[model samples]
Target: ADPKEGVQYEVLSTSLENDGMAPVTEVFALSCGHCRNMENFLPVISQEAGTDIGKMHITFNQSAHIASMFYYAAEMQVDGAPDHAFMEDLFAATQMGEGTTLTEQQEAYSKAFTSRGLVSPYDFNEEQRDTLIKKVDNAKMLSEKSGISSVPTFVVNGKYNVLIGGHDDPKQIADTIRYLLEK
Candidate 1:
């Protein structure tokens, strides 16, 4: 039942720079199907780990880069961390059914934000837009530093990268996160 290094997780660096943030962060991509599936288990993982799991959207490509802004926009506008329901809405819109045109996709994306009374990332004013860009740039930095080539990964203490590939159950993954958080 013990989580082993290099299996459940790997140390990304000897130094930890996760100050002022949640001990555990979920690194994901909004457009990633696997990340969408993983979102369903986050509640369980958070419960089992005894910690609130923060989120960081990866900007690996143009589509994902845009989605990352949408994510940060929600984070900036919302009074607190975006709720699970809001996250689910964004996911659904981002991964809408097949055959949807680019314009349709853009429309759904805007509606997802505006429906919550939040300004769409696409319509962010210059000031808010600057903040979103900085947020996305920070996410990109972390993604590169962590060598995150995949979605639905966890970063514990900002030093250990949880390898979800090694764990089949959400509890197992949560346990690994707990272990690293205490390390």
Candidate 2:
């Protein structure tokens, strides 16, 4: 797949009608190094974008095991969760070369969420495990439906617009958002 070709991006022409309170979707993989780096800069970008630009992170996992973790996180309302702040932290840790294994990743997630005084439904249970598996499957299906093949892919109003990678500065990413906000 040509990353850009096989993926279907829906144009959200009218989504920004109300001051850009539009949904912004992102396709990323938890294990992607570049994605981790990009995430390190997202807090500032997100703070600047504000609530008007609704942000949703979609994990594009190649393995079912990896996808399952994402699924559970999403089901826990990944964006809404209080530990959401830790997402950036975890990404930073990875970028700093602190976490390398799936177990470490899980620990990071758990600690991040717990430190924030939030209870994770995945604390410990077979049901939670199963649910995570199902969420991963769902995420995979959604990713396939969107035709996204790469990490750190951004979709404005459901349509693929641009990409922000390690090569781009935070200002460039902010500029892209400004352009979208203006459009």
Candidate 3:
């Protein structure tokens, strides 16, 4: 059966202008443990849908906002969605109790990028800081536009917000996204 709206996914009031990004985007936060778990499912979803899933880091709070800078730094430097290993490193870096204060958190978080030969968020130059700021602003807007107040969700075709946790299997999630892609 085809996926149903309001069950498998919901249409957004304002469609996201994906512009140079993939049709399926995963909205997540580095500090979200659930998002870290969701990482394992993305590859299967991507395989089933036959498209590289895009990413959007949420700036939901101070820590999340700080984490998003590193995410954008990777995207800007790596020229695409970050690779699996890099994402895993970030997850591990930001795992629970990794840091308490803002500066400590940043230090712990920066290692993930720096270890990969990428620029640390702390070491960002004026131009890089400006770019990261704009990117974070865009992510914040998209997060509000999608009406998603939670982590580890997926948006399909820039308009359909997938109920990622509603399905029983990753394949079903992929199927729902494929269904929405055709809508």
Q: Best by TM-score, which number?
A: 1
Candidate 2: which pairs clash? 7-147, 10-159
Candidate 3: clashing pairs of residues: none
Q: Give one digit per residue, the lDDT tens place, for model 2 in 63-122.
A: 434433643554364554313356565454333344377677567666655666655546
Candidate 1 vs candidate 2: the lDDT winner is 1
Give lDDT tens digits, candidate 1, residues 1-183.
788888888888643465444578888888888888887898999999999999888777776777887788888887656887888888877898688887888888788788878788767789998998787788777776666676788888777888999999998998898888776
Distance from true location, Cα of 132 in model 3, Å: 1.3
TM-score of 1: 0.91
Pairs of residues clashing in candidate 1: none
Model 2 alpha-carbon miss at residue 22, Å? 6.3
Model 3 lDDT per residue over 25-67, tens place = 8988888889898888788999997787899987767757767
Alpha-carbon runs more than 4 Å astray in model 1: 13-21
**Residue 26, candidate 1: C-alpha displacement in angstroms:** 0.3
Q: Count the backbone clashes (under 3 Å) in each candidate.
A: 0, 2, 0
Give the TM-score of each candidate: 0.91, 0.58, 0.89
